[PDB]
Design a protein around this ligand. Structure first.
Ligand SMILES: [Zn+2]
Ligand SMILES: [Zn+2]
Length: 185
């Protein structure tokens, strides 16, 4: 059930060369950036979606995340499933672990002031994280069975909102350079 959403946001710092490729493909080549989020996915996320991707390039030089990225409203909550990163492994308040798709993820919560909002304005964001304990190998087809994460979060008292905004497989960077090329389906 194909992607229908193109995410491309930058704070304006540095160079963020994002290409919206055919189908579910995109690429980013970025240099000395502020914060940016680029990805492909769906306009209306679902807690039951299996996200398929293949990162044919994952080459951050500094802080970049290769991550599921989405939001709910009512209440407003941002969520991440981070499969790989660059020089920084994102963490927060430790909640527990979840096993999914061949990997083990630590579960964290954070609250970020002046965080990017759904539309690239700002907000105080309540964030739920699953962060893989080691960087996922890239270049082969990969699955994120998102219901495993949703169910794990719920069991640890982390409930999502009733209204679903977009749900993308993203490259997020901060204060970094790099290259990524990802196809999502
Ligand atoms: Zn648990
Ligand atoms: Zn806004």
């Amino acid at each position: 059930a194909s992607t229908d959403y193109w995410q491309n946001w930058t704070d304006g710092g540095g160079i963020v060369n994002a290409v919206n490729g055919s189908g579910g493909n995109y690429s980013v080549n970025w240099s000395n950036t502020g914060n940016f989020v680029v990805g492909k996915g769906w306009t209306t996320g679902s807690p039951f979606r299996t996200i398929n991707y293949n990162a044919g390039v994952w080459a951050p030089n500094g802080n970049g995340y290769l991550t599921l990225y989405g939001w709910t409203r009512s209440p407003l909550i941002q969520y991440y499933v981070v499969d790989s990163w660059g020089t920084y492994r994102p963490t927060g308040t430790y909640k527990g672990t979840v096993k999914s798709d061949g990997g083990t993820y630590d579960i964290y919560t954070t609250t970020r002031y002046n965080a990017p909002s759904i539309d690239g304005d700002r907000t105080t964001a309540t964030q739920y994280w699953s962060v893989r304990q080691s960087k996922r190998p890239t270049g082969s087809n990969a699955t994120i069975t998102f219901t495993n994460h949703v169910n794990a979060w719920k069991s640890h008292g982390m409930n999502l909102g009733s209204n679903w905004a977009y749900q993308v497989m993203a490259t997020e960077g901060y204060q970094s350079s790099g290259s990524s090329n990802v196809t999502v389906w």
